[PDB]
Amino acid sequence: LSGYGQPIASALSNITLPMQDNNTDVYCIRSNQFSVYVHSTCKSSLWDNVF
């Protein structure tokens, strides 16, 4: 929450790709067909970046 009183989204938000070759930062499609989905979670802090 900003000082003005409005929500501010942190730049410390994280993105988690599916596991592939012992990593979660690159994902390459290796099948014939695929679908994509987004699952989101939310957490709050108090200016100390401890969610």
Added chain:
Amino acid sequence: LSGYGQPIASALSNITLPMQDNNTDVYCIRSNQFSVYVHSTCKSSLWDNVF
């Protein structure tokens, strides 16, 4: 001063914005009118990156 004798500007130059919400990296406007000013300073080094 470079080895050729010419002035070189360091990438370790710093920019400081006004303080807002316990930070000086993001400053935004929360009033009806604003003005902007730039205040500059210069320091010298000797290839040791110590000014």
